[PDB]
Structure formats: C-alpha cells, structure tokens
Design a protein around this ligand. Structure first.
Ligand SMILES: [Zn+2]
Ligand SMILES: [Zn+2]
Length: 229
C-alpha cells in the first residue's frame, strides 16, 4: 500500500488518514525513516510532524495539493528534534499555522530548529488544554510524561482506531529505544504505558521509526524501558 512521491512515501491508514515518510542518510549507520500523519477533516487538512528537511516538507505539501487539494489548516509537531521539526520554515512559507508543546518551542532554537507559532499546554493528567489547540478537529493531543524527550507529545485520531506515539513508541520487534541522548530514562516506561492508557481503544499504533503495529508496540516499548530504571 505504499505510494511513492519523489523521495517520500505515503500510506493510507484509514479513509482520511495517511502516513508520511521521509529519510535521512547517516554515513556508517543507514538511512533513517521518520513517519508523521496527514488527516483530512472536512474541507481542511491537518499535519502531524514535518519531514527531516524543508525540501521534504514542501514535498509533503505538494502531495497534499495533488491528492487532496484542500488547505492545510494547521500542523502539530511532536518534539524539538530534526525528524519532527526540521521542516518548520516550509510550513510557515506556505502560510500554515503551527503548534507544539510549549517546551518544544522553548528548546527549538538551541536544537537548531525553528519554533512553532503557537504553544500547547497540558493539564496535570496530560491532556492538552483544549483552548490551546483550537480547530484541532479529530486530533486528540496527549502529553504522556517525559520519555524519548522531556517535551514529547502524542496524538490520537478520533473516529479511527489510530494513535500516534511519535518517537516515544517503537515497534513490537524493535531491538532498541533508538536515540536516548535527550531521554528521561527514569520516567520512560511510565510515559509509554500512559500513552497506551490515554488511547485504550486504539488498535493501530503509528510511530516515528517503524511501520504501524498492534498495541504490542506499547507493551514491548514499555518492557524495554523498564530496563532503563
Ligand atoms: Zn526525537
Ligand atoms: Zn526520532
């Protein structure tokens, strides 16, 4: 089901939901896939995460123009790393309103990234404060606690069986938790389990660096994270 578009890949997950995939070569290691989401909600499109680069992100918008041909109302980006926020300038050039965790916006400059235009904040239990996420339609944004990064956030899609763990969640057969350089090793396991508890009905778990999986991605990730503490 993978549709090639230039150097990117697009996969329809549900009637109005597509996964976007972009790649960054790393000498000595390999080309790393990063996944985000595209959601049609009525007469607009919503984006979750940029691609690694501005050019790649502009290609996502080109795909949306060709395949959906509706305005992109907003994007939400799920932490201040290159795979999630590397293409912010491309969104802004296109006139797209952008949203991120307040802390992501705070950290973005020092990470060599451009901040989103708008900051999300979260209730104590981790649900986004709804007034900070206007017009998010079916996107349900949840801060599961610090894990992959301190600022990592997650997104469920109402009307679907899909929840997006971003770089918090790895697939059920993953051999590691990837890049832990900015991780909270104490809180990771609890944060993974909190993601699963936030979206208990989601049967399709989408994530940054693996193809969509069953909820065994959550249990496996949490089990691996237990060993960090
Ligand atoms: Zn990351
Ligand atoms: Zn990542």
């Amino acid at each position: 089901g993978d549709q090639r578009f230039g150097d990117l890949v697009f996969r329809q997950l549900a009637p109005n939901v597509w996964q976007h995939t972009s790649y960054l070569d790393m000498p000595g290691f390999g080309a790393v896939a990063s996944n985000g989401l595209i959601v049609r909600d009525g007469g607009r499109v919503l984006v979750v995460d940029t691609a690694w680069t501005d050019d790649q992100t502009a290609q996502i918008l080109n795909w949306i123009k060709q395949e959906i041909n509706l305005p992109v109302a907003l994007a939400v980006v799920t932490h201040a790393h290159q795979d999630k926020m590397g293409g912010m300038d491309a969104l802004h050039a296109a006139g797209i309103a952008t949203y991120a965790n307040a802390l992501s916006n705070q950290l973005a400059p020092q990470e060599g990234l451009v901040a989103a235009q708008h900051s999300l904040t979260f209730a104590a239990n981790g649900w986004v404060e709804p007034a900070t996420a206007p017009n998010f339609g079916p996107l349900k944004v949840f801060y599961p606690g610090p894990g992959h990064t301190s600022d990592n956030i997650t997104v469920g899609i109402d009307g679907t069986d899909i929840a997006f763990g971003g770089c918090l969640i790895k697939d059920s057969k993953a051999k590691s938790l990837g890049n832990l350089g900015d991780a909270d090793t104490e809180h990771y396991a609890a944060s993974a389990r909190a993601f699963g508890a936030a979206f208990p009905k989601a049967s399709m778990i989408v994530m940054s660096h693996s193809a969509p999986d069953s909820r065994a991605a959550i249990t496996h990730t949490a089990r691996m994270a237990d060993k960090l503490r």
